[PDB]
Design a protein around this ligand. Structure first.
Ligand SMILES: [K+]
Ligand SMILES: [K+]
Ligand SMILES: [Mg+2]
Ligand SMILES: [Mg+2]
Ligand SMILES: [Mg+2]
Ligand SMILES: [Mg+2]
Ligand SMILES: [Mg+2]
Ligand SMILES: [Mg+2]
Ligand SMILES: [Mg+2]
Ligand SMILES: [Mg+2]
Ligand SMILES: [Mg+2]
Ligand SMILES: [Mg+2]
Ligand SMILES: [Mg+2]
Ligand SMILES: [Mg+2]
Ligand SMILES: [Mg+2]
Ligand SMILES: [Mg+2]
Ligand SMILES: [Mg+2]
Ligand SMILES: [Mg+2]
Ligand SMILES: [Mg+2]
Ligand SMILES: [Mg+2]
Ligand SMILES: [Mg+2]
Ligand SMILES: [Mg+2]
Ligand SMILES: [Mg+2]
Ligand SMILES: [Mg+2]
Ligand SMILES: [Mg+2]
Ligand SMILES: [Mg+2]
Ligand SMILES: [Mg+2]
Ligand SMILES: [Mg+2]
Ligand SMILES: [Mg+2]
Ligand SMILES: [Mg+2]
Ligand SMILES: [Mg+2]
Ligand SMILES: [Mg+2]
Ligand SMILES: [Mg+2]
Ligand SMILES: [Mg+2]
Lengths: 74, 122, 81, 134, 89
RNA sequence: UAAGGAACUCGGCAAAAUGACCCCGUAACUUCGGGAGAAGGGGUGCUCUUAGAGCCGCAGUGAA
RNA sequence: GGAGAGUUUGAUCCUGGCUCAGGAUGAACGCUGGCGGCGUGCCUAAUACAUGCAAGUCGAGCGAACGGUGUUAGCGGCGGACGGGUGAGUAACACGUGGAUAACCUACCUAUAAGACUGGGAUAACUUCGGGAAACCGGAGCUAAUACCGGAUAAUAUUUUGAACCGCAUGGUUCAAAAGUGAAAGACGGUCUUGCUGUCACUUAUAGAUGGAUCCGCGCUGCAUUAGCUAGUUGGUAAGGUAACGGCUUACCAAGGCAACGAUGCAUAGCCGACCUGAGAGGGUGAUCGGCCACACUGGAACUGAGACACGGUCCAGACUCCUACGGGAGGCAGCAGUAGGGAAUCUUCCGCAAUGGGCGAAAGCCUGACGGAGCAACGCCG
RNA sequence: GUACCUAAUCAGAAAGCCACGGCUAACUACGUGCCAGCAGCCGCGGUAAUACGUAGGUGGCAAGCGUUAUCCGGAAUUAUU
C-alpha cells in the first residue's frame, strides 16, 4: 500500500516529539520539540507515558495523528 | 429661515462640512435668509484635503431649508435639513459636485451651474 | 458587456439559471416531503421516497448537484426508510 | 565566544551607511510618503546660491542651496571657474562630498538642465559640461 | 487535451524545435509533460529528426494527438504506420 | 410653540436637558485608595411555548 | 585555488577605523559617436487614461430575412477559467524539498462495452401596435432545432441481507441478492430494399491520460526599547454542509489550546530555478527566461459552467470620469501600442498570421497585439 | 528583393574620452600668486606649482571614455572556515 509517518513521544497533556535541528552555520545539534495533538480513542493514555503515533486524515482543527500503541507507562 | 449663528451642512465637495452663518446679505437690518439667498459664513468643520479649510470666511448660497419655500401656485416644498453651497463672486460653485436635492428657485437665482450639478432639482 | 459573445452569455446564463432554480426547488420540496413522511410512517411514505429519489437522480444528471451529493441525499432517506 | 554562545546569539555585521542619503529617497506626492529608490542624480531648484569659506584652506567656494525633487534641502558645490546659476535655477545634483566644506555633500552637474558648461574649458571637458570646440 | 507538438527554441531567424508532449492549455514554451525528440527545419541537408519511437507510441496509445507538423514528422519516421498496425492487430 | 439655538446677558441667571433598574464599556493623572455613575453605548410593554415564537402603539422604567 | 597600498609619530612597534586599486548593473548623467550580429529597454505612480486593435467560431445543429448558389441579425453548441499583464496583498502549507489521501473532483482526448425507443410544449428571430433623447422597454400574435420537457428501457451508482479475504484505526477488494432509482440526437453521405450502412455528433458504465483539490515532515526577514495571545477559541457528541476530511457551520457539554524552541503585535517581503560577487565558507539580488501563488478601479456576493466566485461577464455598495432632451444612461490599459503625470531614466498609436502554438469547424478556413518579424535607443555583449 | 554573392569607383565619408606628485602606467613650459581653483586619500595653491588653468608631449582605453548611485570583494573589519 503506502506508509504513514510514525513518531514516538511523551504525553504532555491528557505528544512531545523532541528532535534535533543541526545548526546551518555552526554544525552543532540543537534539541527542538514539537507537540503533536493526537487521537486517543478511549482516553487510554496518561501524562508522561511514552507513546507511538501514526499520521491520519484530519480529525479536528488540529488533530492529524492517532495513538496506536503505548510504549512506556507513566 | 437662516439667521446669524445658524449652522448649515455644506452640500458640495469643496472641503467644508459645516458652516456657521456670519451675516445675511442684502440690506440693512436683514435678519433671515432662505433658499437662493447668499450668506457670509465661517467653516466650523472641514474634511481633510479640501480646498476650503476650517476657519475660512466664505460666501455660500442656501440650497435647501427646513422652513422651505412657497411657490406662486400655492404649493410648498420643505426639506429635512439646512444645506448651502460655497460660491465664488461669479456665483459658480467652489466645489465640483453637489450632493442631495436642491430647490428649483436656484434657477431663478441664476445659480445655473449648481442647478446643473445637482442630482435632483425640485 | 463589451464583447459580443459575453453579451450573449448573459442571456443564456439567465435562461439556464431560471430552469435550474425551478428544478432545484422542486427537488428540495420532494426531499423535505419524503423526510417528513418517514418521521411519521405515512401510508405513502414509499411513494414519496421514490419520488424524492427520482428527482435527486435527475438533478445529478442535469449537473444541478454533484453525484456525490445525490448519493449522500439518497442514503439519508433510504436508511430512514 | 563558545559555539553554544554563537548558537544562542549569532554574529551580526555592522550596518553600512550611505554617503549621499538625499539621493536614495523618493517622494510620492499622492500618498505624501517617502520612498527608497537609490537614484544616481536628482533634479532640484536653487534656493540660495553664494559662497562659503573652507575649513588650512582659504577660498570663496561657490555653492547653491537646493530643494531636491524629494523635498529635501541640501548644499551642493558648483565646480569649475564660472557659473550661470541664481535663485530659482533648475539644477541636476549628483553625489560626491567636497572636503574642506562642511555640510556640502553633493555636486551640481555642469552642462545639465539650466547649469551651463564651464566657459573656455579645453581639458577634461566632459567633467564640466563643455562641448568640443571647433 | 494532450498534444504532441513543437516548442520553439533557438534564436531569431534560426528556429530549433523540441518535440514535446504537453497539455493543450500550457503555453507554447512553458510546462510540458515529456520531451520525445527534436526537429531542425533549417539544417544544412536533412531536417534532422530525432524522435524516440517507444515514447511516441506510448503517448499516441494514451490519447495524445499530434499537431499537423508533428504528424508529418512522426509519419516520416514510420511511427504512424506502426501505430495503425498495432491498433488493428 | 414655526425656523434658528446663547445671537441674550456682567455672567447660560432662569428654564430646558440628564435621571430608575439590568448588561456592556470606561481616559489623562494618581498619595495606587482613587479619578468613576468617568465618558460612551445597548435592554425594558403584552401573549404564548420552555432562551424561542408571536401581538400592538408615535412612544413600553408609556404616569409620578 | 587566496597579492596589497596610503593614512595617527620627531621616529617606532602594535591596536584600530577610514580611503584606494577589482568585478557587476533594467542604470543615469557629461563629452564623443562608423557598422554588423545577438540580446535588453517605466526599477518611480497597483497613478489617471483619449483612440485603435488584444476572442471568437460553427449554415454539414435550427428557423427566418435580404440578396443571387451567397450573405445578415437571431436561436443553439463549443470556446471565452487558456493564452497575455502585474507584484498590490501575503511571514502563510504562499513557496522549495520530501511524502500521504482507505477523506477527493476532472470538459475536451483515447480504449472497451451496452445503447440511442416513444411523445409533448415553448420561444428568440419575425410581423404588428406603441413608449423613450438615448440606453432600451412593453402589447399582440408566429415558429424551428443536436434548444427544452414528460414517459419507456439500461446499474457497476443507493438501501438492506449477509459472506469470504485483506489493511494502517476509521476501514478496504471481491462474492452476492433482493428493493427502489437514473439516459440519449441528429447532420451530412453510400447503397438503395426505405432497409442496411460510413464519418462526425449523442447517452451510460469502466479504465487510462491530463488537469485540479486537501493534508503532513523539514526549510522561510527584522524588532523583546513587542510577553502575554485565543473564547469557535481547544476537545467531544449530534446535525448540517462540502468533490472531499475537518469548528467548515450551528446546538449542547467540558476548559482547554498557543508561547522565552519567541507566541502575539508592529514593520518589511510575492516564493523558487536562477543571477552578481567571493578561493571557499559566505554575502547580495529576484528585471529578463521557466515553475508556483496572488491580484484585475476599491469592497461584498453569487450565477453559468467540467472548471470562475471570472482582466476585456453579471449583481450590489463606493470613489472617479463621460453622455443626457434631466426621466434617465455609460465606463475601468497591472493586454499591445499610445497619452498625460511622476521621475535622473526606459521605445512604434508599425507589418503578418508565412512559421510555432491556441479556440471553433468535417473541411476549406476564420480568429489569434500569443507569436513571428520590422521600427527606435552605444543600454550590454561579441565581431 | 532582407541575408548572402558578383562587378565597377574612391583613401576617399568613418576618433574620441580620461589621465600623467604618491598609491598608479605616463612631464615639461607658460599663466595664476592660500586668488582663481583642485581633491578618493595623503593633501595641492600665500611669485620658479610635474597636484590649479591652458599648451606641447606622454600614458590608459577606444566607438567608446569618464562621473555619480548601488551590491560583493579587498575587510581575518562579526573571525564555523
Ligand atoms: K607627521
Ligand atoms: K498562425
Ligand atoms: Mg527544407
Ligand atoms: Mg421654538
Ligand atoms: Mg421645532
Ligand atoms: Mg442644536
Ligand atoms: Mg454673546
Ligand atoms: Mg449683546
Ligand atoms: Mg441655572
Ligand atoms: Mg425613573
Ligand atoms: Mg537587436
Ligand atoms: Mg512596474
Ligand atoms: Mg490605473
Ligand atoms: Mg450567423
Ligand atoms: Mg462527451
Ligand atoms: Mg440537449
Ligand atoms: Mg509589496
Ligand atoms: Mg574572502
Ligand atoms: Mg454550477
Ligand atoms: Mg474573462
Ligand atoms: Mg482592460
Ligand atoms: Mg498600454
Ligand atoms: Mg518629467
Ligand atoms: Mg495552426
Ligand atoms: Mg479581431
Ligand atoms: Mg549615452
Ligand atoms: Mg610611475
Ligand atoms: Mg582636473
Ligand atoms: Mg609658475
Ligand atoms: Mg595630482
Ligand atoms: Mg594640471
Ligand atoms: Mg568593441
Ligand atoms: Mg564593499
Ligand atoms: Mg568589504
Amino acid at each position: 500500500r503506502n506508509d504513514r509517518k510514525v513518531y514516538v513521544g511523551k504525553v504532555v497533556s491528557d505528544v512531545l516529539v523532541e528532535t534535533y535541528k543541526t545548526h546551518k552555520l555552526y554544525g552543532k545539534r540543537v534539541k527542538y520539540s514539537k507537540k503533536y495533538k493526537t487521537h486517543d480513542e478511549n482516553n487510554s493514555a496518561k501524562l508522561g507515558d511514552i507513546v507511538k503515533i501514526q499520521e491520519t486524515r484530519p480529525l479536528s482543527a488540529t488533530k492529524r495523528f492517532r495513538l496506536v500503541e503505548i510504549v512506556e507507562e507513566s | 429661515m437662516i439667521q446669524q449663528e445658524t449652522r448649515l451642512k455644506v452640500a458640495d465637495n469643496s472641503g467644508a462640512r459645516e458652516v456657521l452663518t456670519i451675516k445675511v446679505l442684502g440690506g440693512s437690518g436683514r435678519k433671515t435668509a432662505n433658499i437662493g439667498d447668499v450668506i457670509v459664513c465661517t467653516v466650523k468643520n472641514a474634511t481633510p484635503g479640501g480646498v476650503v479649510k476650517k476657519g475660512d470666511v466664505v460666501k455660500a448660497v442656501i440650497v435647501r431649508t427646513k422652513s422651505g419655500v412657497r411657490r406662486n401656485d400655492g404649493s410648498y416644498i420643505k426639506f429635512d435639513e439646512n444645506a448651502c453651497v460655497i460660491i465664488r463672486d461669479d456665483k459658480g460653485p467652489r466645489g465640483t459636485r453637489i450632493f442631495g436635492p436642491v430647490a428649483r428657485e436656484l434657477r431663478e437665482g441664476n445659480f445655473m451651474k449648481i442647478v446643473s450639478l445637482a442630482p435632483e432639482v425640485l | 458587456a463589451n464583447i459580443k459573445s459575453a453579451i450573449k452569455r448573459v442571456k443564456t446564463t439567465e435562461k439556464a439559471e431560471a430552469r435550474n432554480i425551478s428544478q432545484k426547488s422542486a427537488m428540495r420540496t420532494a426531499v423535505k416531503n419524503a423526510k417528513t413522511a418517514v418521521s411519521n410512517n405515512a401510508d405513502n411514505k414509499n411513494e414519496l421516497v421514490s419520488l424524492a429519489v427520482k428527482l435527486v437522480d435527475k438533478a445529478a444528471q442535469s449537473n444541478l448537484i454533484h453525484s456525490n451529493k445525490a448519493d449522500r441525499i439518497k442514503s439519508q432517506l433510504m436508511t430512514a426508510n | 565566544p563558545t559555539i553554544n554562545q554563537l548558537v544562542r546569539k549569532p554574529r551580526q555585521s555592522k550596518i553600512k551607511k550611505s554617503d549621499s542619503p538625499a539621493l536614495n529617497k523618493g517622494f510620492n506626492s499622492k500618498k505624501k510618503k517617502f520612498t527608497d529608490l537609490n537614484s544616481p542624480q536628482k533634479r532640484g531648484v536653487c534656493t540660495r546660491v553664494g559662497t562659503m569659506t573652507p575649513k588650512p584652506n582659504s577660498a570663496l567656494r561657490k555653492y547653491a542651496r537646493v530643494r531636491l525633487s524629494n523635498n529635501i534641502e541640501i548644499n551642493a558645490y558648483i565646480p569649475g571657474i564660472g557659473h550661470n546659476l541664481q535663485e530659482h535655477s533648475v539644477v541636476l545634483v549628483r553625489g560626491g562630498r567636497v572636503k574642506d566644506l562642511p555640510g556640502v555633500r553633493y555636486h551640481i552637474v555642469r552642462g545639465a538642465l539650466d547649469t551651463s558648461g564651464v566657459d573656455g574649458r579645453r581639458q577634461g571637458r566632459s567633467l564640466y559640461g563643455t562641448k568640443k570646440p571647433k | 487535451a494532450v498534444k504532441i507538438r513543437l516548442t520553439r527554441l533557438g534564436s531569431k531567424r534560426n528556429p530549433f524545435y523540441r518535440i514535446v508532449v504537453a497539455d493543450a492549455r500550457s503555453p507554447r514554451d512553458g510546462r510540458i509533460i515529456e520531451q520525445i525528440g527534436t526537429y531542425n527545419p533549417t539544417s544544412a541537408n536533412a531536417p534532422e529528426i530525432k524522435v524516440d519511437e517507444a515514447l511516441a507510441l506510448k503517448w499516441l496509445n494514451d490519447g495524445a494527438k499530434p499537431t499537423d507538423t508533428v504528424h508529418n514528422i512522426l509519419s516520416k519516421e514510420g511511427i504512424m504506420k506502426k501505430f495503425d498496425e498495432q491498433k488493428k492487430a
